[PDB]
Design a protein around this ligand. Sequence first.
Ligand code: HEM
Ligand SMILES: CC[C@H]1OC(=O)[C@H](C)[C@@H](OC(=O)CCN(C)C)[C@@H](C)C[C@@H](C)C(=O)/C=C/[C@H]1C
Length: 393
Amino acid sequence: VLDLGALGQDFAADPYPTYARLRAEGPAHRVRTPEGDEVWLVVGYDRARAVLADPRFSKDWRNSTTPLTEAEAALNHNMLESDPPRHTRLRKLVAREFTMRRVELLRPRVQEIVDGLVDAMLAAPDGRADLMESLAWPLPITVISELLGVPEPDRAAFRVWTDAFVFPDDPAQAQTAMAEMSGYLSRLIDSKRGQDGEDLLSALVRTSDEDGSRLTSEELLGMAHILLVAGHETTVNLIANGMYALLSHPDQLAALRADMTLLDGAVEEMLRYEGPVESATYRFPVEPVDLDGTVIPAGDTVLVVLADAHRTPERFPDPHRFDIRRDTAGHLAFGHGIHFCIGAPLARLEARIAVRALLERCPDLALDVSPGELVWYPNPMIRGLKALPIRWR
Ligand code: HEM
Ligand SMILES: CC[C@H]1OC(=O)[C@H](C)[C@@H](OC(=O)CCN(C)C)[C@@H](C)C[C@@H](C)C(=O)/C=C/[C@H]1C
């Protein structure tokens, strides 16, 4: 049992040499997380990709030997914490909302949001700002909030609850937060009921009312939760981590600023090199699974380490090089298999717009701090910064 809490901020900041040295010793390893839970890491690209798609590794908490808390059990009837056939049905509900076509329709508004956020940011008197406060955070919360129908006065609460259960001081504190947000969401579902809003939460509340067999009240709260947590948190971190990647590689920043057709590939390499999902969501083996002689017990918690997958040199040569022109095909930053990210085109749309606007409107854009002054969150599932100080000319 490697104690990841004991490794401290050095591991949070640069966990890669740790995964890589585990990977050399075998595909799977028992570790304790900073919070105190024993889990399994699965490392190495080929094994990570296999495990992600393998039906022996379930997402349904009934297959876990760790009981849900009260507040969590209110929230688990969502597609990411389901297996077929419930998974199949939940995913089909919101299928269509996230295609490249429906997301294309959002390009104008996404642009307008960024255009505005970037205005405000430039109005800074000394040409200095924290990219997280100025753009990384507000852009995704705003986009997802409009989609779902979270009214403007309530959106502030989401950062706090989200930070609370994504990065708490104690598990006891995430509980309260989740209860509180879940409390909020029920009340927001109830407020939509038969009120004829055109947002997705109203469309879903409709579905549940019409045919509570296609969608239960509980699945309604779960779906609302899930769409909110990805639509801001991971996307915020893609934006901030990928900009950090660009800023700390002055050479690749110049290369993209010189040629914007390089943009889609740059965003892919930011997903590869500094993706916000360090480790995929909990997997639970239905039966014991032997991984090249290392047997994981049924019901244990298994974290597939996407970050280590992406530094696997036989898959991504010279893995420690951030190279915007690199072949990134087949990366796992949006997962793999039947739980593959539904929001991937939206995440991509937002990041691409945000990066282009920063490069085009912030002259001599640069990191305003040294890498050693950055603070990364210890949660082994999320790769993310506390602040990103930037400056421009
Ligand atoms: C950069 C941004 C994003 C990244 C890196 C990301 C990554 C991921 C990953 C790795 C998974 C699979 C988790 C696993 O297999 O354990 C996932 C699934 C999921 N994502 Fe995203 N995602 C992002 C943005 C979004 C957005 C904007 C939305 C909302 C539209 C969203 C909604 C979902 C949903 C509902 C699932 C569950 C899918 C299923 O179970 O079939 N994601 N995503
Ligand atoms: C939908 C994609 C998104 O995943 C999530 O929202 C996680 C499911 C979500 O986990 C839960 O909601 C737990 C609820 N059960 C305990 C009841 C999220 C908080 C996990 C976290 C690693 C993340 O930010 C994860 C973000 C992405 C991986």
